[PDB]
Amino acid sequence: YQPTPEDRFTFGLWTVGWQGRDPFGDATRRALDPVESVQRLAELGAHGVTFHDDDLIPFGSSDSEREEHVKRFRQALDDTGMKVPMATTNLFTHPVFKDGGFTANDRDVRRYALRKTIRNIDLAVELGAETYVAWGGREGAESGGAKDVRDALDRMKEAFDLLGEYVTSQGYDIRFAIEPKPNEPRGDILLPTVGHALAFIERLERPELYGVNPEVGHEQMAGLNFPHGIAQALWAGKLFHIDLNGQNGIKYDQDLRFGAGDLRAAFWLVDLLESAGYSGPRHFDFKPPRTEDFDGVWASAAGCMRNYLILKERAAAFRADPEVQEALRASRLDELARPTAADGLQALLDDRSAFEEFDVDAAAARGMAFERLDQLAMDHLLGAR
Amino acid sequence: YQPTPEDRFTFGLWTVGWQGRDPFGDATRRALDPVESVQRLAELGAHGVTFHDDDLIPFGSSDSEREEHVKRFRQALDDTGMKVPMATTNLFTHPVFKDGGFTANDRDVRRYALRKTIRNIDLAVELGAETYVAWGGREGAESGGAKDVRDALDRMKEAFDLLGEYVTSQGYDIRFAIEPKPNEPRGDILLPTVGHALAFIERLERPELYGVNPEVGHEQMAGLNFPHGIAQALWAGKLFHIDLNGQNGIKYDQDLRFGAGDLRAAFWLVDLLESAGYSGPRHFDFKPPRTEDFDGVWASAAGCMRNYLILKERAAAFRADPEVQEALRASRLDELARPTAADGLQALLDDRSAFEEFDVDAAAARGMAFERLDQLAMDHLLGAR
Amino acid sequence: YQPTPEDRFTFGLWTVGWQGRDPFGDATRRALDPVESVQRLAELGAHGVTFHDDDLIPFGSSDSEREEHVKRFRQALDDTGMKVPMATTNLFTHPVFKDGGFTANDRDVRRYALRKTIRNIDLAVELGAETYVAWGGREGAESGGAKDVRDALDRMKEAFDLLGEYVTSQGYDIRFAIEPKPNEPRGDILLPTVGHALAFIERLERPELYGVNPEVGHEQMAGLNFPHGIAQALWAGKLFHIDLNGQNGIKYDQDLRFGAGDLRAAFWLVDLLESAGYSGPRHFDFKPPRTEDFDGVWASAAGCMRNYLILKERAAAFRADPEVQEALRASRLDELARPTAADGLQALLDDRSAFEEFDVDAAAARGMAFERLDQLAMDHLLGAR
Amino acid sequence: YQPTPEDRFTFGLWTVGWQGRDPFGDATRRALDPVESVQRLAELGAHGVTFHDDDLIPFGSSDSEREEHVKRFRQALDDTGMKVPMATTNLFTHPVFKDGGFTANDRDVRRYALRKTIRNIDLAVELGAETYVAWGGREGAESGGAKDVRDALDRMKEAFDLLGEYVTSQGYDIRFAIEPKPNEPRGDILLPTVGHALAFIERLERPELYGVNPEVGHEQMAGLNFPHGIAQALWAGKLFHIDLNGQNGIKYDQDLRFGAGDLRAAFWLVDLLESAGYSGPRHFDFKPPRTEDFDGVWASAAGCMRNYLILKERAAAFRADPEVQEALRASRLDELARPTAADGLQALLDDRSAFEEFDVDAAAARGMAFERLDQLAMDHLLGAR
Ligand SMILES: OC[C@@H](O)[C@@H](O)[C@H](O)[C@@H](O)CO
Ligand SMILES: OC[C@@H](O)[C@@H](O)[C@H](O)[C@@H](O)CO
Ligand SMILES: OC[C@@H](O)[C@@H](O)[C@H](O)[C@@H](O)CO
Ligand SMILES: OC[C@@H](O)[C@@H](O)[C@H](O)[C@@H](O)CO
Ligand SMILES: [Mn+2]
Ligand SMILES: [Mn+2]
Ligand SMILES: [Mn+2]
Ligand SMILES: [Mn+2]
């Protein structure tokens, strides 16, 4: 289970660089240099990294420090062969974003958020990123009178429409991916699920510029089936990027390594990405627990990749198994994939076997044989075949 | 706080007619006649009722019993002046729908579901209904291999496209409203939130035929902010109908009367429907607890209407209050409603006050004054002004 | 992975006998005869069965039908060698229990509940049961004024104290196990977790007669760590019996087969029962999904036992693995098991290395190496060692 | 609705002193001096304050700075007449506590935690505190192999037994209150609910020294009924102190001001504390949102007290209302408070009206009239009587 840079494994700077500050505790780990992380992640088998603006260039940097940071960074990528497939803006840490970036009630703030975002889009394009993610972690409210959601969705649409105008006036090949989250650190966050972010995109002036960046633990914080939401994003053609991690149910966002948390969901997610042939980065947006030293950091980033690769092999052996393929026909998966009425409306309406002479008791009596199927999936995931 | 039939209050037959069967218990109440419920609901001040096919006509009825039921029903509406604004199909109770209706793996089942739905659309139109709701409570799965969600979303789109072809070939004025629910009675239900149902609609052949029917307690079963989801539905123009009830957090669907459950959410929902000017039915989809006799039933349906009308008055007094209007300007709600950059992209880009000379420390220092605002809302809801 | 009747696998009659009625659907399966279930469960390898009164003898039975049912039953146990380790009362289905059994506001109801319970205790003892479970599924409320919880806990204590007086005046060897559940079918259920049921027991007149019956999916409906709650029950000496099943997070109680749901929790539960040497029944309180026919029923009851036995083997190989034992010392599990201050208070107070000369920076710097440990557990569960 | 220092309103230093650092954001507010907070809280009507060791004396302080801090503090209490009813240890912020304090796997850490706690017990007693709270926010785990819960509960019992030995060897009048929390900042926290903390206390050597400190939002993070858990703590005699705040359902701990969150729960909690006659501090453990400046801080701490006092008046008018008292008899609350069988076991057993001649159909038919009751409670909370 050794990754190679063909597995398309990526990591944010902020992930292995998390110092372990939490709502109740001080950092437990020193700040990593981005160049160290690039070299360490390359040795483990990763294929590239991603960044916020403010991961790479310290907030308030001059234009001469700005360039020094970027040049160092760039030398590390050239030295290791790592890519930068995705980049993003920090519109959540600084106190100025305490009411949001693109939806902050103060108009001057919303203009400043767009200017900070456009400056980093130019950087991203310079460093080769194909996808530009937007996670509006500060867009929301703790109380009902603080935010008119209609106005806020006008502002959000306005900001994303300007960014699409900017990208298409520069000639950039870059797409946008909106990342939903239902809460945390706002009481409630706007566009809180994949379905809200898909819907929203269909109102933008150029919807084809925008897809979604769903993260495992964000839909699971709403108690939702992550594989189900990713199947919808795939069905809409809008799975532009994906964040992988683990989460134990509806509580704070834990950001555990990928394969911790809900292990059977992780199996069914891998099964789906691989059989749909998703070809983007497999990006890990996780935090090594603050119990760990830098050894535990690199163990935890390794086990992300390892659990992906074990669950790919188990999903591949599940679908390849003739007994599974027989059970899938027993459960009528083959029939699900056929049109209901490709004969058309009229034929349907004149078809006496569809109503007047349908035997609803004989149909009701047929067993779906799902439990046998699911125990086959269980025996495959567990290697107990 | 007396309703009148101008308040537009409606109730399903199944709501006050719930006999109190639950996963662990037998009915506690005898079956009501639909004509009794119409007469009792009329006396309480309601403006109409809604029905499943199988509420009104017993599953398997001949065509001579079918008509007898409808004629009785119709005489009660003529006698009381109640309307039927909304109608819907039962594609969940019968054992034939145990794997779904429009997404059942068996193709014969999916054809039978569409035929049962079209027969009731003709009825609905006969009885004056404007909105036809679809709650696919059986569309989903308990295990990951049982349902391919891509195929299932093809089937669901196929069924809704046929229904739109049928309605527009009959000349019917009727629209469809999809009602999302995240789980229960399936493990996971397809289109589990308002945002998933909005997104889905944008893929149908005629999207303008379809909106959403959101229900209070369904988004709250995912831990989501119901007023936020309804603001999005309003922003998309797709709030066709609404189900009102209460729910205490993330657990089984309780269907408590409206104003029980999350009382401050109920306040902010009323505030929003009334200030957006939603003009559909205020429909109560609730179950009187099985602790109650028929006296407790009619008390519980009354208290729905009463709590709506109290919370309308409190929301109206909140928005009318000059001190509230001052606080809303203190918190910059007025600025949220202004465009971020109606000056356009270029101007934004050349505006030095938006970046190069933006004072981010002075902006960060400004307080949003949300807590004062929210305590004003609290004092108004509580009558402690 | 073949059970034998030495594995101590048991099943309720109500589990494989669930007809598939749910809040929204009719039965999908015919009623099983208890004698059939005994013979089928014996062939699969089970070691015994459990029952409600009203599983075995139809509510309202004469005393001549009562005995006929029991005699049939008994002949099936003699024919198969199945035991009856546990028995329990139905104080939830009948409408008379709509406000509870032992805590129903009506005093006549609470007297009737105790009389129905004592009659079945005599039966249980006749059929050899060692443990008598009490799940008060109707003890609770949907609204705050309906139940005074202090009075209700007086009534509950009163009922359990009478039952202990009855058992000890008959000379019976039988113990009681209280089964907690946080909600469903009441809004909120009294003693909603293992910790509330442990606490409660410490107020009964004879606490040594009472332990707990925790069920997987009940603590998981509160988002709680089931292995953690069972470790507490073990630490208190009060794990009298255990209900095993699966549950996908905080929602309705699904009762999935054991190993579905939260698979890593299932691993850590098996690890704990086996290394603590729990010696009671491994009882499966689950419902085969209503998608299934009787073939899917027996598949689902088989896969309970199979997943137990796979997860026992994986836990045994985890703890036996020298590299695991090394990692457990790396993470200082060995130190957790040592007293903090067996030197006593005074010595602690005079120990300068415990405060005045404790180097808190060197201690803070030590990594706990938990992630390496947890990936070892992952590789063992997955057979990817 | 003006507090006075007779209302017994208290606040932690850390509450109004929260600088607004969150998992994703920097402080938004400067650090308050404890003496300023004492003077500001006194003007608002509060009756005292509480503290962690490290709120009042900066971690690592000399013994000459230590005393300077305490003397300043003390002068502010003498100047304002504020009390210090409760004090507590910080065993969560420093990196040394990253695996816990009393349950940390490292034995040297667990000795250091006890020494830091005992030093602050002496301080507390000096400043008049009656209650000493222990919130073990770091006692738990993110993964199953990291913590053996049995060993950890031995360590926890050992630490609390030493603290009780210390207090009773010094002659101190001080009691301990354990505060449960189910998660955050650990994956899972040990003793995660009131019921687990009650149970645990019954194993300590001197249980009468220990009660519970429950907090609103902590039980609500498990989806539990906070008034129900406090009724149990009251029934056990172990409600030593209480933390008041608001929380919107199962998610991160929001710490909203008291009366935000679940407003009907807040009503029923006030009803219960007041009618049980709880006489401890009404302590607010809340965080003013980081959207606020210091004006919004003092608004938010004011609205805590105000919403308590409004909900006390509404609960008092509910219980005083003859129509309510009539409804409570209609719903048989009076009967709940009577013994079930004060006639004893034998009489119960010979009572033919309790079984052989009980009419279970007539009892089942009686309505509980809970919905009428609950709408009366609604009309009272809303002032719509
Ligand atoms: O919840 C935090 C969120 O997952 C964050 O890591 C975003 O993904 C990042 O800001 C954009 O990539
Ligand atoms: O959860 C049940 C659901 O709310 C149901 O009542 C639908 O609304 C009805 O089938 C369509 O109107
Ligand atoms: O939630 C249902 C509960 O699990 C029930 O099956 C009990 O365990 C049974 O009544 C007592 O054994
Ligand atoms: O969740 C944080 C917790 O509520 C904390 O504020 C404790 O109450 C304090 O450490 C002891 O008083
Ligand atoms: Mn992410
Ligand atoms: Mn509904
Ligand atoms: Mn059970
Ligand atoms: Mn607290």
Angle between helices A194-201 and B226-236 (to 10 degrees): 20
d(CA B361, CA D300): 24
In chain A, the residue whose alpha carbon lies closest to the alpha carbon of D188 is A248
Q: What is the CA angle B108-B109-B113, rounded to 5?
A: 120
Active site (annotated) includes residue D52 = yes
Judge: B341–A111 Cβ closer than 8 Å, yes or no.
yes
State the alpha helices, DSSP H only, in D88-225: 107-126, 149-169, 194-201, 216-221
C-alpha dist (Å) from residue A33 to A123, A143, D24, D343: 19, 39, 20, 78
CB-ligand 1 contact for A179 (6 Å cutoff): yes
In one-letter notation, the amino acid at residue D155 is R
In one-letter notation, the amino acid at residue A281 is P
A246 three-state secondary structure: strand
DSSP secondary structure of C324-375: HHHHHHHTTHHHHTS-S-TT-HHHHHH-GGGTTT--HHHHHTS---HHHHHH
Torsions phi, psi of A86, nearest 5?
A: -150, 140
d(CA C340, CA D109): 9
Could you tell me which residues of A are annotated as the binding site for Mg(2+)?
A: 179, 215, 218, 243, 253, 255, 285
Length of chain A: 385
Contact C371, A256 (CB under 8 A): no
Catalytic hit among C47, C52, C283, C380:
C52
Chain C hits for A381, Cβ within 8 Å:
263, 382
Judge: A22–D251 Cβ closer than 8 Å, yes or no.
no
At A347, list the tokens: 């034929």
Q: Which helix (H) or strand (E) holds C11?
A: strand C9-12
Atom of ligand 2 nearest to the CA of B285: 6
At C152, list the tokens: 């209700």
d(CA B162, CA B164): 5
Contact A280, A8 (CB under 8 A): yes
- Tokens 């006692």 locate to D139
d(CA D323, CA D317): 11
In chain D, the residue whose alpha carbon lies closest to the alpha carbon of B363 is D28
Atom 7 in ligand 3: which residue has the minimum CA distance?
C135
DSSP secondary structure of A50-112: EEEHHHHS-TT--HHHHHHHHHHHHHHHHHHT-EEEEEE---SSSGGGTT-SSS-SSHHHHHH
d(CA B349, CA A165): 12
Mention every residue, 6+ apart, whose C-beta is less than 8 A from residue B36.
none
Judge: C24–B137 Cβ closer than 8 Å, yes or no.
yes
Q: Which residues of C253-270 are buried (b: 16+ CB within 10 A; e: fewer)?
A: bbbbbbbbbbbbbbbbbb
Among D179, D193, D287, which is best to mutate for testing ligand 4, by the most ligand atoms less than 8 A from CB? D179
Atom 4 in ligand 4: which residue has the minimum CA distance?
D285
CA of C131 relative to ligand 4 center, distance in Å: 40
In chain C, the residue whose alpha carbon lies closest to the alpha carbon of B93 is C25
CB-ligand 2 contact for B243 (6 Å cutoff): yes
List residues bridging with A244 in a β-sheet. A284
In the B/D pair of chains, how many CB contacts fall below 8 A? Answer: 122
Judge: C292–A382 Cβ closer than 8 Å, yes or no.
no
d(CA D210, CA D134): 10
Q: Could you give the residue numbers annotated as active site of A?
A: 52, 55
Judge: B234–A374 Cβ closer than 8 Å, yes or no.
no
Longest dimension (CA), chain C: 80
Distance from CA of C261 to the nearest CA of B (A): 9
Longest dimension (CA), chain B: 80
Q: Which technique was used to obtain these atomic coordinates?
A: X-ray
d(CA C291, CA A367): 6
Q: How do C175-178 and C210-212 pair as beta strands?
A: parallel
Of residues C113, C189, C115, C119, the one with CA closest to residue C153: C189
At A213, list the tokens: 């960046």
CA terminus-to-terminus distance, chain D = 19
CA dihedral C46, C49, C55, C58 (to 10 degrees): 110
DSSP state of C142: S
Contact D244, D11 (CB under 8 A): no
d(CA C190, CA C170): 29
Q: Which residues of A23-60 are buried (b: 16+ CB within 10 A; e: fewer)?
A: bbbbebbeebebbebbebbbebbbbbbbbbbbbbbeee
Chain A hits for D96, Cβ within 8 Å:
none
Chain A hits for B111, Cβ within 8 Å:
340-341, 348, 351, 354, 358
d(CA D230, CA D223): 14
CB under 5 Å of ion ligand 7: residues: C 215, 243, 285
Judge: C231–D153 Cβ closer than 8 Å, yes or no.
yes
Let me know if A356 is exposed, middle or buried by CB neighbors in 10 A (0-12, 13-18, 19+). exposed
CB-ligand 1 contact for A133 (6 Å cutoff): yes
Among A14, A94, A226, A243, which is best to mutate for testing ligand 1, by the most ligand atoms less than 8 A from CB? A243
Q: Kindly list the structural domains of chain B, giving each domain's residue range(s) and its CATH number in brackets, ordered by start.
A: 1-385 (3.20.20.150)
d(CA B116, CA A96): 57
Q: Could you give the residue numbers annotated as active site of B?
A: 52, 55
Which of C250, C291, C293 to mutate against chain B (most B CBs within 10 Å)?
C291
C-alpha dist (Å) from residue A94 to A89, A253, D26: 12, 20, 6
d(CA A153, CA A156): 5
Of residues B304, B336, B303, B316, the one with CA closest to residue B377: B316
Catalytic hit among D55, D99, D262, D271:
D55
D141 three-state secondary structure: strand
B230 three-state secondary structure: helix
- Tokens 């034995």 locate to D107
Q: Where are the strands (E) in chain A, listed by range?
A: 9-12, 48-52, 83-88, 131-134, 140-141, 175-178, 188-189, 210-212, 243-244, 282-284
Chain C residues within 8 angstroms (CB to CB) of chain B: 20-28, 92-95, 97-99, 137-138, 142-143, 146, 183-185, 187-188, 221, 248, 250-254, 256, 260, 289-291
Q: Which helix (H) or strand (E) holds B36?
A: helix B34-44
Among B56, B84, B186, B243, which is best to mutate for testing ligand 2, by the most ligand atoms less than 8 A from CB? B243
Chain A hits for B318, Cβ within 8 Å:
145
- Tokens 């004969």 locate to A343
Distance from CA of A293 to the nearest CA of C (A): 4
Catalytic hit among C55, C99, C262, C271:
C55
d(CA B114, CA B94): 15
Distance from CA of A83 to the nearest CA of D (A): 26
Torsions phi, psi of B180, nearest 5?
A: -80, 155
